Amino acid sequence: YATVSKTHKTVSRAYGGSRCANCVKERIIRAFLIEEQKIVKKVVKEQTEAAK
Amino acid sequence: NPLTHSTPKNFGIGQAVQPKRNLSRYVKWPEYVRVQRQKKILSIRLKVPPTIAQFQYTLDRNTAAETFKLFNKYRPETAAEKKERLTKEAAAVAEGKSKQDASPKPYAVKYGLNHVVALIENKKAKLVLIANDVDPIELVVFLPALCKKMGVPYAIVKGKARLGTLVNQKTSAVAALTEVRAEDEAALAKLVSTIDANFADKYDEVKKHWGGGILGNKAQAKMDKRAKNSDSA
Amino acid sequence: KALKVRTSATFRLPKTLKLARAPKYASKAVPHYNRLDSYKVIEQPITSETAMKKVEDGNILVFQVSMKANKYQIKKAVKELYEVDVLKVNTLVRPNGTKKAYVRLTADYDALDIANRIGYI
Amino acid sequence: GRVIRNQRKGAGSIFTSHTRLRQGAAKLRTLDYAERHGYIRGIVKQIVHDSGRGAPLAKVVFRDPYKYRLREEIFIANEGVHTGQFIYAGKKASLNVGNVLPLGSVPEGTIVSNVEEKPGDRGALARASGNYVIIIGHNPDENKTRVRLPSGAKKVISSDARGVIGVIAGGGRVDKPLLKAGRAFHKYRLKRNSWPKTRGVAMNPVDHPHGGGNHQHIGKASTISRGAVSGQKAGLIAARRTGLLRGSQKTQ
RNA sequence: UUGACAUUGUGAAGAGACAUAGUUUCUUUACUUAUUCAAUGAAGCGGAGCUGGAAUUCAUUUUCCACGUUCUAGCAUUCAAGGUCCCAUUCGGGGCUGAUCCGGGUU
RNA sequence: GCUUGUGACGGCCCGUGAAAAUCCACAGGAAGGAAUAGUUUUCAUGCCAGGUCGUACUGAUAACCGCAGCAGGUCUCCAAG
RNA sequence: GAUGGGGAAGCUCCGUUUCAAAGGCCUGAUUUUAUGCAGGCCACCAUCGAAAGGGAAUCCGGUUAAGAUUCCGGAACCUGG
Ligand SMILES: [Mg+2]
Ligand SMILES: [Mg+2]
Ligand SMILES: [Mg+2]
Ligand SMILES: [Mg+2]
Ligand SMILES: [Mg+2]
Ligand SMILES: [Mg+2]
Ligand SMILES: [Mg+2]
Ligand SMILES: [Mg+2]
Ligand SMILES: [Mg+2]
Ligand SMILES: [Mg+2]
Ligand SMILES: [Mg+2]
Ligand SMILES: [Mg+2]
Ligand SMILES: [Mg+2]
Ligand SMILES: [Mg+2]
Ligand SMILES: [Mg+2]
Ligand SMILES: [Mg+2]
Ligand SMILES: [Mg+2]
Ligand SMILES: [Mg+2]
Ligand SMILES: [Mg+2]
Ligand SMILES: [Mg+2]
Ligand SMILES: [Mg+2]
Ligand SMILES: [Mg+2]
Ligand SMILES: [Mg+2]
Ligand SMILES: [Mg+2]
Ligand SMILES: [Mg+2]
Ligand SMILES: [Mg+2]
Ligand SMILES: [Mg+2]
Ligand SMILES: [Mg+2]
Ligand SMILES: [Mg+2]
Ligand SMILES: [Mg+2]
Ligand SMILES: [Mg+2]
Ligand SMILES: [Mg+2]
Ligand SMILES: [Mg+2]
Ligand SMILES: [Mg+2]
Numbered sequence A: 001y002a003t004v005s006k007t008h009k010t011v012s013r014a015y016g017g018s019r020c021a022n023c024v025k026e027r028i029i030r031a032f033l034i035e036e037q038k039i040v041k042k043v044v045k046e047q048t049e050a051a052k
Numbered sequence B: 001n002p003l004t005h006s007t008p009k010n011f012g013i014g015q016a017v018q019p020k021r022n023l024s025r026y027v028k029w030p031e032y033v034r035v036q037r038q039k040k041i042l043s044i045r046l047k048v049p050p051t052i053a054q055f056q057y058t059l060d061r062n063t064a065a066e067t068f069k070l071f072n073k074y075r076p077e078t079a080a081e082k083k084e085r086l087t088k089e090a091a092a093v094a095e096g097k098s099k100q101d102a103s104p105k106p107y108a109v110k111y112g113l114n115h116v117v118a119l120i121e122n123k124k125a126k127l128v129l130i131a132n133d134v135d136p137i138e139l140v141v142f143l144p145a146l147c148k149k150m151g152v153p154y155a156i157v158k159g160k161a162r163l164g165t166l167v168n169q170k171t172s173a174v175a176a177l178t179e180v181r182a183e184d185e186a187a188l189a190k191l192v193s194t195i196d197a198n199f200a201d202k203y204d205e206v207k208k209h210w211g212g213g214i215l216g217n218k219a220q221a222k223m224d225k226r227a228k229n230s231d232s233a
Numbered sequence C: 001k002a003l004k005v006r007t008s009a010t011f012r013l014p015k016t017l018k019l020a021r022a023p024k025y026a027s028k029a030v031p032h033y034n035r036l037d038s039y040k041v042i043e044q045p046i047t048s049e050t051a052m053k054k055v056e057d058g059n060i061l062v063f064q065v066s067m068k069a070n071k072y073q074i075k076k077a078v079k080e081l082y083e084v085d086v087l088k089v090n091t092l093v094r095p096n097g098t099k100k101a102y103v104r105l106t107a108d109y110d111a112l113d114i115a116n117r118i119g120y121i
Numbered sequence D: 001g002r003v004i005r006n007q008r009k010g011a012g013s014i015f016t017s018h019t020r021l022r023q024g025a026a027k028l029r030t031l032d033y034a035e036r037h038g039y040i041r042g043i044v045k046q047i048v049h050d051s052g053r054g055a056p057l058a059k060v061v062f063r064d065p066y067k068y069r070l071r072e073e074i075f076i077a078n079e080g081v082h083t084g085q086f087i088y089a090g091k092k093a094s095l096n097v098g099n100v101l102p103l104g105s106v107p108e109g110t111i112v113s114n115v116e117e118k119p120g121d122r123g124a125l126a127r128a129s130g131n132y133v134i135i136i137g138h139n140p141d142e143n144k145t146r147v148r149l150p151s152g153a154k155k156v157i158s159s160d161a162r163g164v165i166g167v168i169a170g171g172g173r174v175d176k177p178l179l180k181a182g183r184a185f186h187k188y189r190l191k192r193n194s195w196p197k198t199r200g201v202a203m204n205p206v207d208h209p210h211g212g213g214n215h216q217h218i219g220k221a222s223t224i225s226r227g228a229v230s231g232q233k234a235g236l237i238a239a240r241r242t243g244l245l246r247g248s249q250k251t252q
Numbered sequence E: 001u002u003g004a005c006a007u008u009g010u011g012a013a014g015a016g017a018c019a020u021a022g023u024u025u026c027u028u029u030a031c032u033u034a035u036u037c038a039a040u041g042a043a044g045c046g047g048a049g050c051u052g053g054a055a056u057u058c059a060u061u062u063u064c065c066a067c068g069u070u071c072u073a074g075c076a077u078u079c080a081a082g083g084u085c086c087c088a089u090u091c092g093g094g095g096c097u098g099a100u101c102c103g104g105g106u107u
Numbered sequence F: 001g002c003u004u005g006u007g008a009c010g011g012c013c014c015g016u017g018a019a020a021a022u023c024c025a026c027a028g029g030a031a032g033g034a035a036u037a038g039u040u041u042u043c044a045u046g047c048c049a050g051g052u053c054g055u056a057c058u059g060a061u062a063a064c065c066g067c068a069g070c071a072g073g074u075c076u077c078c079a080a081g
Numbered sequence G: 001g002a003u004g005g006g007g008a009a010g011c012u013c014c015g016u017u018u019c020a021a022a023g024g025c026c027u028g029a030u031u032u033u034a035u036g037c038a039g040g041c042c043a044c045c046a047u048c049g050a051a052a053g054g055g056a057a058u059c060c061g062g063u064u065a066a067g068a069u070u071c072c073g074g075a076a077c078c079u080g081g
Helices: A022-050 B031-045 B061-074 B079-096 B113-121 B138-149 B160-165 B182-198 B217-229 C049-058 C071-082 C111-118 D005-011 D033-037 D181-189
Strands: B127-131 B154-157 B174-177 C042-045 C060-065 C086-093 C099-105 D040-048 D057-063 D070-076 D086-089 D100-102 D111-113 D133-139 D144-148 D154-158 D162-165
Touching: B061 B154, B061 B174, B061 B182, B113 B138, B113 B174, B127 B138, B127 B160, B127 B182, B138 B154, B154 B182, C042 C071, C049 C060, C049 C111, C060 C071, C060 C111, C071 C086, C071 C099, D040 D070, D086 D100
Parallel strands: B127 B154
Antiparallel strands: B127 B174, C042 C060, C060 C099, C086 C099, D040 D057, D040 D086, D057 D070, D100 D162, D111 D133, D111 D162, D133 D144, D144 D154
């Protein structure tokens, strides 16, 4: 592999020659939702604290 | 403000890597460090017999400072001062015909353990300083008793090195005065009194008091609190 | 005041000053001369019938050469001793405890010529 | 005579463990600040056969609280745990198969595995396939917890000692007859050199107490004293009874 | 394997005698520094304090708990962004705070 | 067809069938970089160098071990009709 | 199988990361100058052990009495610079 040009060792996506693409779809979706649900989680317990 | 943001980190178990902190309380010291520290601890956990326990009581930093101030006027000759004196007599005496008495009677601090002991036994010392480090303590432990029975006023003082500096050695274990200029007789009488009040007078009472027996501080806590609730409900 | 602050709980051996040697006397009086000059490197021509042939046909000088010498030392030696240019040097150890160097000269030189200048045949 | 087989085992020359294919030692996490004040999460990444062992292991990975990286751990997998599952370890963790909690935080009746004999020893009790220990009571003053081991014994240990909820996987492995010599062969081939087994009653006297005689037979009581001596202890050592056990065993 | 002696110290209660002052000796049960065992790239121990509140006030707090993470097989690192004070305003860079105080007993 | 290679599968296990050097990749974004001219050697082409020791042959009814040119013993690859 | 260590009268036995103050890389700081300090890491703590295991890279044709994937001819490839 050292004897061979960089384009033989990647595909041009995030996580190119490392994870498998359907795998990166999953990573992205899950990241987005979980980062969203975080705002959802916070605002509930900000509400619990003031309604108690 | 600008295009700059607040993003406060959360260091509360299960997220964010803990930041760098002062772990000095936790470092795994070299054995020689661990050993010299434990030598201290072990030396306090035990009940320490009165005749060793009477050290630890040391001249207070005021009386001390005053006592080094006096003793410092009586430093022994320096190499040069003596090279100076010899030629000032070796020439002069041998010729103008003094009796090896074209030199003045020297006044100095007397030192060396063996020296001072003989001085004390002959009631020549007027004031003796005993260091409080002295690791074979035996070199020195008999000296409060010694001075006391010989009626000689003494003081346990911080600094073997400090006794050293006043005598041009690295250390010195003891320092004493047998002689004094008249301009100083009075300063000394006063010093001896504060000192005699703090040691020789107290000696017979100190002889009855074991030291040590001190818990470490996690065990103090444990007991200052166990014995807070137990009784006083 | 107050103590240092160590953020590592590991205590490592202090980085300490390493003086260089400044001897009070010399290690050995006189340095040894060159243990392997060219004359000790290339010891004697090898002139077997079949060595001779390599010379006439392959522009190759064949030398018995020091056991202690490598392809570099043989090359340099031949060069310096013979005013000649070496393409490449092959070597083998003989079954009598000695080293043979097949030394190919470059095409500017004529090993045959250059062997009966050194004086053999 | 000569040194008998059970004495030669101790120098373990040809008697050491066959260890090459082993996954590594199975252990709980080191008992740190996380596990002992809160809980810490990992993921089971892999559950995997360990040669010589019955129960599968579970490879579980956690973030390092003090450095940016992943630190992997080798658990014994409890029946039910799975890849992708989140595993929670700590005092303030919650009672789920797979999590690891100190016995003080789990109610009487809880079922656990791989429990520590002292806190932090990273696990000692009930590891073999199918085994487990039941919590049967607590003594909150001097925090101890009383448990019952696979063997039947009850024992009390520190309420800080940790355990992992559930039973060890691979159960019933021993319900199945080996059938042939060869399956025992491959069984002990991955353990240690203890198989097959010559009866001492088939050896000569030089070899063993049981050795010799013109008929095979032990010729003296085969129940040997505790205070017998190396070279003497073959047979039923320190046996307090002997013969076919009649009627319900069951520790009372 | 079993006993004695030595390693072996400190308390407290109870027995044991000059024959109902405590020198002393045994039994119990406390202590930790000797000795002993585990752990860890000795990392968060012990003691106090801030806030939340259960709690019921017999003057006001007498206390006891807590005191950042659990739908998800992501991401978590550059003394931390933020705040604030300096260097003499250059790029760079430093302190404090963010992350409470005290004791250096690694647990 | 025969020998060998290889693939996608399938049977088996209380057996589930090494390790390390080494090579690459990705996440990261410290940094370093242009218009009067910078960045680029994981693209092409071009220059130099690569030491040391082994290397013959036998490998067996005569080159090995059995006192020997011993009907014995001694690991393996190629394989036509 | 050395080493801090622990046994042993001792030849030596134990241990191998062990109860040790165990070491070196990347560049910056130099423009007295050659390399002192300034950061930050990394704490991995010997070494021997395979000519069948792992492993950077070569082929064809010709050539000798006896060498050849090693010489000659041609044509490649790898590693370092
Ligand atoms: Mg590609
Ligand atoms: Mg003077
Ligand atoms: Mg010609
Ligand atoms: Mg060669
Ligand atoms: Mg082993
Ligand atoms: Mg066998
Ligand atoms: Mg049998
Ligand atoms: Mg049997
Ligand atoms: Mg028989
Ligand atoms: Mg017998
Ligand atoms: Mg018998
Ligand atoms: Mg018999
Ligand atoms: Mg029988
Ligand atoms: Mg006893
Ligand atoms: Mg620790
Ligand atoms: Mg075949
Ligand atoms: Mg398989
Ligand atoms: Mg790759
Ligand atoms: Mg910078
Ligand atoms: Mg290139
Ligand atoms: Mg080299
Ligand atoms: Mg050959
Ligand atoms: Mg033959
Ligand atoms: Mg034969
Ligand atoms: Mg050894
Ligand atoms: Mg090797
Ligand atoms: Mg090899
Ligand atoms: Mg090989
Ligand atoms: Mg050929
Ligand atoms: Mg030839
Ligand atoms: Mg041949
Ligand atoms: Mg060629
Ligand atoms: Mg060419
Ligand atoms: Mg190159």
